[PDB]
Structure to design on (121 residues):
């Protein structure tokens, strides 16, 4: 998706996306969600270009994917 | 009156609607029955 080291996820964000946007046995949905995060990062690059590397924390996941779709067990 | 765990889904709602409404978020039935029933009996009981 064109980005090269201007954007970077953390592992907590990965676990959040798996637990809250992905319910299957396989891995296809996680692939689609990571694609969505990278493409919204590309649109944010074309709006305002920042400098160096941007590290997406676990808080910004609704800002990149939207409303959480599934709820974890407690 | 709406469940508390649905408060995530108040964001796909249009903006001018959302200041018209007022949501009460609940998680127990007792607070709902406190909020909705008038405190005084009027009709006689069924017995």
């Amino acid at each position: 998706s064109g980005m090269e080291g201007r954007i970077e996820v953390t592992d907590a964000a990965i676990l959040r996306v798996i637990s809250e946007y992905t319910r299957e046995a396989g891995v296809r949905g996680l692939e689609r969600e990571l694609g969505k995060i990278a493409r919204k990062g590309a649109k944010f690059w074309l709006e305002g270009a920042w400098e160096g590397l941007r590290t997406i924390d676990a808080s910004d996941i609704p800002t990149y994917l939207g409303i959480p779709r599934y709820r974890p067990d407690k | 009156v709406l469940p508390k765990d649905n408060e995530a889904q108040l964001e796909e709602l249009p903006k001018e609607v959302l200041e018209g409404l007022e949501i009460k978020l609940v998680e127990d039935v007792g607070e709902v029955l406190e909020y909705l029933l008038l405190p005084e009996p009027t009709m006689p009981p069924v017995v």
Observations:
- Strands of chain A lie at 7-9, 54-56.
- The CA atoms of residues 25 and 46 of chain A lie 35 Å apart.
- The interface with chain B takes residues 67-68, 71 of chain A (CB under 8 Å).
